[PDB]
UniProtKB/Swiss-Prot annotation:
<feature type="binding site">
    <location>
        <position position="6"/>
    </location>
    <ligand>
        <name>Cu(2+) 2</name>
    </ligand>
</feature>
<feature type="binding site">
    <location>
        <position position="10"/>
    </location>
    <ligand>
        <name>Zn(2+) 2</name>
    </ligand>
</feature>
<feature type="binding site">
    <location>
        <position position="13"/>
    </location>
    <ligand>
        <name>Zn(2+) 2</name>
    </ligand>
</feature>
<feature type="glycosylation site" description="O-linked (HexNAc...) tyrosine; partial">
    <location>
        <position position="10"/>
    </location>
</feature>
<comment type="subunit">
    <text>Interacts with S100A9.</text>
</comment>
<feature type="binding site">
    <location>
        <position position="14"/>
    </location>
    <ligand>
        <name>Zn(2+) 2</name>
    </ligand>
</feature>
<feature type="binding site">
    <location>
        <position position="6"/>
    </location>
    <ligand>
        <name>Zn(2+) 2</name>
    </ligand>
</feature>
<protein>
    <recommendedName>
        <fullName>Amyloid-beta protein 40</fullName>
    </recommendedName>
</protein>
<feature type="binding site">
    <location>
        <position position="13"/>
    </location>
    <ligand>
        <name>Cu(2+) 2</name>
    </ligand>
</feature>
<feature type="binding site">
    <location>
        <position position="14"/>
    </location>
    <ligand>
        <name>Cu(2+) 2</name>
    </ligand>
</feature>
<feature type="binding site">
    <location>
        <position position="10"/>
    </location>
    <ligand>
        <name>Cu(2+) 2</name>
    </ligand>
</feature>
<feature type="site" description="Cleavage; by caspase-6; when associated with variant 670-N-L-671">
    <location>
        <begin position="1"/>
        <end position="2"/>
    </location>
</feature>
<feature type="site" description="Cleavage; by ACE">
    <location>
        <begin position="7"/>
        <end position="8"/>
    </location>
</feature>
Length: 16
């Protein structure tokens, strides 16, 4: 769970 949230967070934080 946390891993996915963190990954998605980092990813989306960058690319937008």
């Amino acid at each position: 769970d946390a891993e996915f949230r963190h990954d998605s967070g980092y990813e989306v934080h960058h690319q937008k």
